[PDB]
Nucleic acid binder design. Structure first.
Lengths: 23, 79
RNA sequence: AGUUUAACUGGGGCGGUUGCCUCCUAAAAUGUAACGGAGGCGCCCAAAGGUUCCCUCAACCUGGACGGCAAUCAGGUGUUGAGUGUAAGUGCACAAGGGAGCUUGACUGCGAGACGGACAUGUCGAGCAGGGACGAAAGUCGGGACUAGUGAUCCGGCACCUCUGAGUGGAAGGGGUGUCGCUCAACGGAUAAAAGGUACCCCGGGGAUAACAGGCUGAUCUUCCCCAAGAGUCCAUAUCGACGGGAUGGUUUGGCACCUCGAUGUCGGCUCGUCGCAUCCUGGGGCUGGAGCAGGUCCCAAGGGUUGGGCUGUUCGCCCAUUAAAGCGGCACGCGAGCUGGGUUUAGAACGUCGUGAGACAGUUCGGUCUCUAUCCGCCGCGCGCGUCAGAAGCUUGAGGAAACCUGUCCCUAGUACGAGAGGACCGGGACGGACGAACCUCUGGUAUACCAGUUGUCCCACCAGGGGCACGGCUGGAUAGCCACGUUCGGACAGGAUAACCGCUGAAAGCAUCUAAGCGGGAAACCUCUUCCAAGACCAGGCUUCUCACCCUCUAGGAGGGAUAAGGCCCCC
RNA sequence: ACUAUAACCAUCCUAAGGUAGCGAAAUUCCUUGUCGGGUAAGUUCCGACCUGCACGAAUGGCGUAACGACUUCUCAACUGUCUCAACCAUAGACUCGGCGAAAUUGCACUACGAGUAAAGAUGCUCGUUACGCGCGGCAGGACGAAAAGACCCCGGGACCUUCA
RNA sequence: ACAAACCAGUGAGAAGCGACUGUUUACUAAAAACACAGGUCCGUGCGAAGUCGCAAGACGAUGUAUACGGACUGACGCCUGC
RNA sequence: UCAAACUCCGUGAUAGCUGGUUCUCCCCGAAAUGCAUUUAGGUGCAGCGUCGCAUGUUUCUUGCCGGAGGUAGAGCUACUGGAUGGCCGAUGGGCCCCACAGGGUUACUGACGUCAGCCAAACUCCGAAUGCCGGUAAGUCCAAGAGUGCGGCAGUGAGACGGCGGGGGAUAAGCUCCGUGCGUCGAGAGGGAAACAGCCCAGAUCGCCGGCUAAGGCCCCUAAGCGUGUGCUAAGUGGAAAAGGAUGUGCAGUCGCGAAGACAACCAGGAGGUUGGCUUAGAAGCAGCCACCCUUGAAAGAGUGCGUAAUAGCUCACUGGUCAAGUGAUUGUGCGCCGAUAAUGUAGCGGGGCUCAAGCACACCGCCGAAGCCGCGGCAGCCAACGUGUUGGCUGGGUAGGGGAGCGUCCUGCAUCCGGUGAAGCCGCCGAGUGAUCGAGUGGUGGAGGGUGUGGGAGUGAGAAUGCAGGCAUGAGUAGCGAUUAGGCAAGUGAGAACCUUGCCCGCCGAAAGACCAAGGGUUCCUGGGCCAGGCCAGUCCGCCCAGGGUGAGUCGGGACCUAAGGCGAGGCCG
RNA sequence: CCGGGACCACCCGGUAAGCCUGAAUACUUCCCAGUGACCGAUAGCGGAUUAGUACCGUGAGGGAAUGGUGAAAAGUACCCCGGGAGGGGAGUGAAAGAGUACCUGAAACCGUGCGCUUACAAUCCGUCAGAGCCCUCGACGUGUCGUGGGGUGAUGGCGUGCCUUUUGAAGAAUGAGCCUGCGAGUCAGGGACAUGUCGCGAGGUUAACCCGGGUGGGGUAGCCGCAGCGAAAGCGAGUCUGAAUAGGGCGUAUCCACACAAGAGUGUGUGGUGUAGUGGUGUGUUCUGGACCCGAAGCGGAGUGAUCUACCCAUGGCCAGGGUGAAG
RNA sequence: GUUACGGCGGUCCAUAGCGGCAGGGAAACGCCCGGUCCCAUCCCGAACCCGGAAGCUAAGCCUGCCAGCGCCGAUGAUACUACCCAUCCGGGUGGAAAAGUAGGACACCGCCGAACAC
RNA sequence: CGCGGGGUGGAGCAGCUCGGUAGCUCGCUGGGCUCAUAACCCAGAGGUCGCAGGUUCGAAUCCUGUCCCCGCUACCA
């Protein structure tokens, strides 16, 4: 779903380096 | 539903206890094993559970003899 | 009467499991979890142990009486695929596998050193002695090729012992050594001894843990889509579209158990809505196996509208009549500090079934307390203050918002086009309507608490008469105003702009073609304008005008402060 | 002898195998069973069938006049229950005077959207909107108040049952 | 408009349950539950049986099996099978 | 109040449960794992922390050396299994010779074997890297504040996410269960990620209006660049997404053809045999199909299609010409397009806005940017050195928790000191200390006991326990001011009157809202007086307050008369 | 005859089934005299006060709150406002900022007054920077500057309460309305373990108890150390096991030197050094106790309750009016 | 010291083996001749054992010839991989580095003895 | 949510592994009695609980998937 998708794609950022808490 | 499995035995901590070069006393357990993946050789004896123990001091030497992998104890010459 | 009635558990219950051994999981040391994947054990052997010696199979080929695929015989090939008491693994052909002889080490006392290790357990062990077995001897033998084949402690039993012997001798009893007795199997074993119900329930706790909702996931579900085997007279793609494949959405059943168990009230309905569009109608359009009427399918479109009833608690659904249509969904399966409370889901009772029973049933049945003065946000309305660079007043602009946006039947066009006919139009005109809404109260109609009349009972005004009080205004019959709807009138528009799907023009890139890349147009109830309403607190605080447009005092006259006034306004008053 | 069922038969078991009567029932899951009646339309109701999930003879069965603040269905009349609501009065609400509480309360000059976050935000982010203060009102939220959730689980009690 | 106001039955049909009048969960259940008369069974031969009580004693009952207690059923009708 | 009342006691019941547990600073600093458990939210032990003692580099890191493994990968004609296609061909099934046997033959199955290609967590002829064990040489070495042993004291024993390897699950879950000298949060601030425990950077001793940096960023919000150069992108891609669709564009190619004129366009031609045959009533360049030819000749397809009932006519493929060079088909890539699709409001860049990049790629240049590092200064802990307290090095986030050192309060032994020329306490001012906190510094208030040092002892520190008591707020000058009868005028009294008094009206009850008793209450009755409490307002009134007075019985109701139920019960019986 | 730990024998002791018996010992309703490194009015008895009172409950039973003027009432004559209350003058008093509401008189809370600020603004409410205004201290020169200090705060940046419990809370999870007081690891014991310190020291120490108006002096009974091993008999630097001189277990404080055996991990002898505990006390954990504090539902004992309610007993009373119309 | 040699051993027990096709018998190893003796066959003088020396290297054994089957097998590359970089590319770095394949690798070493030599 | 449970001649029922599986009644076939059923006699005949696996030598028998009508299936909120 949209919410989880967005929150996961947030990790694809120059700062997060492809990893985030709960992905 | 249910599973007919779920069992397991206790881990027996088999393996090699004293590797190559390790200086060992007599009677020291070198190899815990079930069969003779490692065979006994020079100054090494085989117990009832196919355990290998040093019959004399020395450094453990792993060798081969007619295809069998052997465990030998080479003496440590005192100065 | 006192108590027990286990735990694990992707909530609990039911089911299953609980210890030991083997493999995988296990990530090449060891170890490593799961209600992870597979199996086995709770023995057997007096030889299937020990030792000495000897041998090497299974399978295949060939030949052989019964004899066959396969019995036993012979030869050959065969290095291991057989067999190893029994699971699996590791091993074993040097044999630990097969056979024979002799035997009892399937010993006593001990044990350097190690493994493993929460602890308790567990495991190996050369070597010394005793007295033996086998062997010529070397040497091996403290059970079995290995790893499972078991049970702590307490308690007690048996045998033996140069232990102890409650004044002494004895004995009892105790003690040592060896050993026995527990599916204590929930197998580190609460007790020697123990099952259930609670919806009559209580307490302590928990969002450590389920039900509702939320959240994640999206198997399932839903909505699409890709390929197109094909059905479709032929024709894959008018339409349906198998086998398969890819995704959306998050509404279904679920999975997880992340907030909430020192309370997040549940289904359905009522009321109030609001949103999305995956559009039911209305609107626009492409294709059609579209003649026309009517459709099918797809695209655009969410402006408005989307009925009332029977049954059921019901949602849903079926049915009845209608309709232009009777949309799908979200918002804590919207909305219980807004309502209900029929159902679910307390206590009562009953049926069936289960249970010895207490009692239980996503079985049924009858009955069964729905609390709260709104602080904040929010929302609806209304004021007070200040500001908008003097004070006031009138009239206003309209940024920006709100509202509204529905639709049918009939007639003419025309029984024309179309069509063999049946039947039957688009486009465009006209009338009458339904529903919805606003305003109004002339009509109609309702109401009328100081109107009029009648009238019952009773009491009173001394009495008659006439009236009054009380009884729902006592009841009745009527009823102007006001409020109002059942009533009256009106409304939704016309028109324009820019657009969606779509139709195109001119046209290249690409000598053609091409709705496009430059350009130009058309095109919908959607959008902006238009209609109605609010609105300059529109802090860019607006604009056009008009009125007053003038005095004093104190501080030391700096910047102010106080007073009295005008225009005007407020209060009091009607 | 069409079909259907099965009066009938065989066989197994039993202590005996449910008789009369009743029957989608206060009992019938399937189930809104089927049929009929009633209704324009009836998951309810009545009658009947019997395929009794899971009736049954003193845990009485089947009926029953009369009775019932019982339950269910239907009808007449009646009506604002409704279509569909309007008006009048009274008590409050409102205003003035007087007395004068309450639950609650971590705070506070307590907005909205889309997000983010212990996964539902007045308080965080980015924006949008919003002059300050009150009065009457509405109840969407403050996971509002109240009651240390009764459901569920864990632990412990209590009472009850019994071939613990 | 004459029962004038006040006061003052709604009625009918059918089914289920329970026969009925009554009783009941004071404070969410008035019911189909309880009771009931009637029935059957069992017990009791009399300071009975049963019950309260350690006992005495008491109730039962100043009664005596046409009585008393307990159990189930629950008017009445037909019945109550193995 | 009842599935076993209430009260007291036992009793301060017990609660593996919840809650609470009060001053400071310094140093160190976890765990959420294993085993076992009537155990699973508890506990014991181990592991991990601290302190002390002992030992002393044994730890740890790196290099080298000696070693064992069976994972990844690979392989299987190397085993067990699976498994694709061929070849052979046992075997069977049939057929024919037809018996019965023995034969050939096959439309078939077709083992075994063999050729080639494959697969496996429980397959392995093989086999890593890593990791592990050991040794060794060094490193760190005024420190990791290591390691080991002993002992005191613990807490933890619910973990989370992320990276990697894996199981379960649908190779879904912000799922679950494991592993990982993996990390972070936990217990960790700071910067970035819009916000955002677990991601990235970096581990906060304090101070500074000093500097360099990391990650990330430099159009404005927002500090630093609308940076430089070369290209790309037209989709606001960037600033979500699939199968799959697609003359998007650029680059790099490759191939076919081409001035001997290509592809495109324009002009002319574009077949006979022949219907090549089957099939339909037919078959023909074209329902449909078998073959898929030759011939005049450029070119003619068994015809490219339409049209076609078959044909015709139509244009074709193709041939020739007119002008005139690029044209056409494909390969991979770099950016893009579509697919694309929810519900309060843009809302899938954080916002504005950006292609005149502020987007993408590659290079390059600087800068910003943290509590990181440096600089200056202060403090503390450990250690070392030297000297009998200074310097220097290193370190100094911190939850549970351990250790150490202290502040403040009270009571005290002793010794001192202050104080009616004003102690304490309280309110302040001015200040001080690293902290709790201090003030023998000051004023004010106040009125009588206190301070200091050294020891001793504690009812010694509260913000929380839905804590207890008191006082006071919020709501709020809000609700409500207690029925279903209804009050009004005049006059009076009085400081004051809606309410008291008087009068007149009106209205209410009238099987009562009247009158009398009992029970119960107990002076509330009456008179006089009062009005700060009470009365739900006020109050001159009162059932309120104060004082005084008031209740008279042979016949009433009761005793002295009687007994009922029942109670007490001499003796008594029983216990 | 009884007892000497079943029992028998021997021996010993005693002589039951009969009674009395002071002191040493336990306790304090009450009385007297005193003490406190005890409380000092939310404490200490529940009770400094009307106290087992008021009040609650039918009852058993539960069970409060309420102290301070001043040295002395000298307790404010008198006048004024007022109906009074209350106040202002006056007086008393050292002081009325001691007025029977009274010592001191905090905070919450409520006001009044002055300064600053605030009505275009989105605020865990503060912090950092900071305009402007006001006040203050100094300087110079005459109001601008400073090594300044304060109060306000326009405005900008940053910024998600405390506690508890959690993987994780600003959290929409819990608790808290606010202030003031009170409210939770304490005490005993020759207790246990460890550690520190003091005393003595191969010894240390007393307990009860006695004497002392005390905290001091006596008190050797015991306790811990001083030899262990063994089931024990027992033996003893050895001992147990065992047939063993044959090894192992435990012990011989530890260390040094030598010698001899060994290099199976080192041992055996000799010599030497020579062993350190114990009692006070502090601290930290711990045992028994309520044991850091609060908290159940419920269990038991003994009693109170049938004036509510259920049932019953005795004795009385009540049931308007109207209908229906049984037996006989 | 030399043997076409007899034993005893060794090797990361296959570069060693298997299968070749041509050879040898000095002593020795062997088949071989017989069972009287020790001894022996779950029956067998086959074997084990004993006594022997008639003939034969036929076989074993031994020597030479080999890539025919098996075995060994690099390098380089690839896979996989610890660490690192990297906002999905499981992309890439520097290190380690297989299996399979291919090129290529066909017994050796020691001690004693025998015959001869000497 | 989920679990569970016997099969055998044509029908109905038995029989648990020393190495076979079978037996009973009915049915059926043949004969007989009768003028023609039932009752009598039998040479009577009759089945692989389906395949996979045993430790298997061999399993109806034992174990698992299947063999499949099966009583009980029950998430109580």
């Amino acid at each position: 779903a949209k919410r989880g998708r967005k929150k996961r794609d947030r990790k694809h950022s120059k700062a997060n380096h492809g990893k985030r808490p709960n992905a | 539903s249910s599973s007919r499995n779920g069992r397991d035995s206790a881990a027996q901590r088999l393996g090699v206890k004293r590797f190559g070069g390790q200086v060992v006393k007599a009677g020291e357990i070198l190899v815990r094993q079930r069969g003779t993946h490692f065979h006994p050789g020079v100054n090494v004896g085989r117990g009832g559970d196919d355990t290998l123990f040093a019959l004399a001091p020395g450094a453990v030497e792993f060798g081969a003899k007619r295809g069998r992998k052997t465990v030998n104890i080479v003496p440590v010459a005192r100065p």
